[PDB]
């Protein structure tokens, strides 16, 4: 027997697209660094994305094995400061054991609108969860308030890329926000050049190190407006 609408794969670079501009990617870019597997299953792509990633990784204790994620298409890149809003909602859960992984938004920006979309002048991460001894790069900058919620801000370098990571003080399995609030904070408190940086990508997923786990994304939405 068989079924259509089959949007499941354990392939390194499997990608499924549909609904309002969503693509779900297995993205096992660091699979070389370990042993095991990563799979994704798309339940539904409409106005929202529903999907799950299932994985088991051992070895390469200190290396990300993958970033299975959902993201939105951005055919036309726009300047951060010109973008009106970047609303998003996320409803998710993690199951498994010995989880060394995170759950986070990931966005890249650059002054070059044709920059490759998987890196940039800057990277903005918003971590909704963290398991085990894994954390963002850089060093703690302190706690900040964005739209009435606390985040611990980290700041560091990857080569020439500057990375800002906003980490929730406890797991947030159910969230709603606007990434514009985070850019505004960086612009007004950190000298982030919002007037000259283009949003290259807008992703949400998990970075697994080791363990065995299933990230279930009950629902995710995101868009870039005006």
Residue numbers in the entry: 1 to 226
The authors write:
The endoglucanase 3 (known also as Cel12A) of Trichoderma reesei (TrEG3) and Trichoderma harzianum (ThEG3) constitute an example of these CBM-less enzymes. On the other hand, these enzymes are particularly active in the amorphous regions of cellulose or in the hydrolysis of soluble oligosaccharides, which suggests that the catalytic core of these enzymes not only possesses the catalytic functions, but might also bear CBM-like motifs specific for interactions with amorphous regions of the substrate. In this study, we report the three-dimensional structure of ThEG3 obtained from X-ray crystallography and investigate enzyme-substrate interactions using molecular dynamics (MD) simulations. We identify amino acids at the body of Cel12A that play key roles in substrate binding and, thus, provide a structural basis for the fact that Cel12A enzymes relinquish a cellulose-binding module.
